[PDB]
Design a protein around this ligand. Structure first.
Ligand SMILES: [Mg+2]
Length: 300
């Protein structure tokens, strides 16, 4: 369309922390990473603006021009809410109507076609669902993704209840995107990411028993944390390659990772927003994950 582009059927849209002072133009990241799709993170409640803002108080509209320029090369974005720290819009809003108004302001500012709810903290899932019923009614072209903590012993944790609530309420669930990271008791590697994927497959089959195997895999995305994780385990470049190959074979809907600005070498094991604590060259993980899209027709 004139102000929005198609996202491929099998896509890779890694997270960019928009609040970092190192932030490059989106078009520059496209050139460097090889992907022209990104998940922009995170919108939170700003007390200063009494509404949505990046990391809870950078002006909402700051990146409109960057998104326009990315769209000029055929790129597109997913706008993400939430993340590790609150206050989330869905926590601060007193009513689902207020919450939907805020989500719609974000959609309208960016002409967004896809939203991501990265729900890590405790929330009122009923209020969220009620808000999203309003959003999908008013903005019926906007897809919803849910990015949620996971563990290779269980699949989704409390986030399972969120998806259950969505499905019951009749809220569209376009993507379920477990965060395959930070288990603490077992390492963040490809084997464990695949176990999470399999568990989530079973979880979604329970909610949507009428869906085919291929329909369920299409709903699933996986998001590792590249290189060193918060628990000192390391999701390696070999893990990336193994996961990409598995993802291609299973024809899953999407991959992402935390994060674009971490895709640089750094001192071994150091946790940073600016590098991944491994020795792989700049953009090495990005280039491996792009192979997922390339299997299914993508070229850039
Ligand atoms: Mg929120």
């Amino acid at each position: 369309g004139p102000n929005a582009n198609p996202i491929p059927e099998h896509f890779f849209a890694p997270y960019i922390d928009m609040s970092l002072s190192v932030h490059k133009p989106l078009v520059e990241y496209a050139k460097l990473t090889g992907t022209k799709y990104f998940t922009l993170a995170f919108i939170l409640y700003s007390s200063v603006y009494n509404g949505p803002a990046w990391a809870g108080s950078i002006p909402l509209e700051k990146f409109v021009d960057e998104v326009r320029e990315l769209r000029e090369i055929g790129g597109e974005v997913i706008i993400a809410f939430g993340g590790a720290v609150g206050p989330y819009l869905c926590q601060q809003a007193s009513t689902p109507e207020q919450l939907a108004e805020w989500y719609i302001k974000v959609i309208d500012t960016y002409n967004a076609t896809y939203l991501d709810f990265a729900i890590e903290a405790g929330i009122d899932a009923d209020k969220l669902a009620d808000a999203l019923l309003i959003v999908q009614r008013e903005r019926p072209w906007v897809k919803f993704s849910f990015t949620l903590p996971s563990d290779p012993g269980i699949g989704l944790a409390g986030g399972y209840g969120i998806i259950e609530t969505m499905a019951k309420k009749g809220v569209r669930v376009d993507r379920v995107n477990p965060m395959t990271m930070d288990y603490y008791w077992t390492p963040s590697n490809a084997e464990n990411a695949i176990k999470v994927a399999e568990n989530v497959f079973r979880q979604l089959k329970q909610i949507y028993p009428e869906k085919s195997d291929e329909e369920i895999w299409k709903m699933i995305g996986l998001t590792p944390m590249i290189g060193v994780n918060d628990d000192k385990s390391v999701f390696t470049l070999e893990d990336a390659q193994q996961l990409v190959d598995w993802a291609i074979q299973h024809k899953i809907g999407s991959l992402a990772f935390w994060s674009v600005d971490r895709d640089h070498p750094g001192p071994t094991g150091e946790v940073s927003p600016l590098h991944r604590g491994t020795n792989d060259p700049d953009w090495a993980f990005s280039h491996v994950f792009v192979k997922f899209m390339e299997a299914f027709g993508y070229t850039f």
